[model samples]
Target: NINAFKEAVTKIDRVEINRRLELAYAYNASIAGAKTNGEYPALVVEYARMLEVKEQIGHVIIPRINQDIPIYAGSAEENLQRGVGHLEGTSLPVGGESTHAVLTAHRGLPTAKLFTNLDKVTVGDRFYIEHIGGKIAYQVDQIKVIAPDQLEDLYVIQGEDHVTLLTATPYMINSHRLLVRGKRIPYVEKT
Candidate 1:
């Protein structure tokens, strides 16, 4: 994502946008860690985090999948067990141009359903992120079944804002990753 501060000012509230964008841009440039989503077997995502604090940053609502999961700060095992986990290395969930926030949740949980219906998501489907700043919406424009170690798909593209939903593919098998990527769009309250 490129520097398009003006482009993002219209939708995202001005107060949160400035501070959030600063953090997001810095995170994208900062480097140090295994870029991979996580090691195999466990399927837990391993990434670096900034001065961390406060958990349950937000919640991702996927109407298509009937999922309204809570978003935790990091993709730890316990966090995913409860709900979605935000990938630290990527941008924060606060929408901004040049930001690509990566959120992950576990699938195939018998007790609690998470991303079990991720495969059902397709292009044009919309997802919502409700955080303290404000609620932002994204339209699913792309979906990919990439290798578990695939890191390229999570990078921030210049000028575009994205929030990608990540989960393991084939349900219980858990070999590859199912990336449901969405582009930031104007969020409208549903009538």
Candidate 2:
């Protein structure tokens, strides 16, 4: 198990080592008091508390048609179970034209409705990302389903601002990934 962990860590890019370590710490912190097979573990309780803190404790919001969902800043399995997880290789959603952030969540989790309704969003529909101090609005510009190995779809382009949302389709079978692409727009204040 130790060797496996070390190997996994080594595979991560050097620039992302700190982030991956922090995520691992957060995951462990959330599950520290859990018992084996506990119906409701401390992990879920801690994550729920983090969610309730609200208003940017290192989290962002994605406005959906029916409701807005929060996405935490980690890609660990536990983090994803609680909210959308920001993929490690992408830039943080700090609102800039040269950078992009990729967020992923489980499509159809029995325990939670994470990204189950993402398909309800269509091109030209708008969603807002509420970060620490400012809100960046994104307009859906493209949508596609690609094989799981297609990393090119996640690459950041020069002189572009985009936020990519990813999820596995057909529930748990996961042969392909559904990608929802959005471009940043001038932030508009909603009354």
Count of clashes, each model: 7, 0
**What TM-score quantifies how close candidate 2 is to the native fold?**
0.66
Alpha-carbon deviation at 46 in model 2, angstroms: 18
- Candidate 2 global CA lDDT score: 0.62
Off by over 4 Å in 1: 1-54
- The whole-model lDDT of each prediction reads 0.71, 0.62
Best by TM-score: 1
Model 1 earns a TM-score of: 0.74
lDDT of 1 by residue, 1-191 (tens): 01121233345565665575466446554421223333221123323322122444667788997877777778779878877888766777777767788998887687778888899999999999876545799999998999977787887665688999998977778999999999999976774
Ten residues in a row with the worst lDDT in model 2? 42-51
Residues 1-191, model 2: lDDT tens digits: 22333344446565565453355335433332232234232112233222122322234345654545566656778778767777655555544545566888888777877788788879988777654333578899999999987776776554677888888875667789899999988875875
Which candidate number has the best lDDT?
Answer: 1
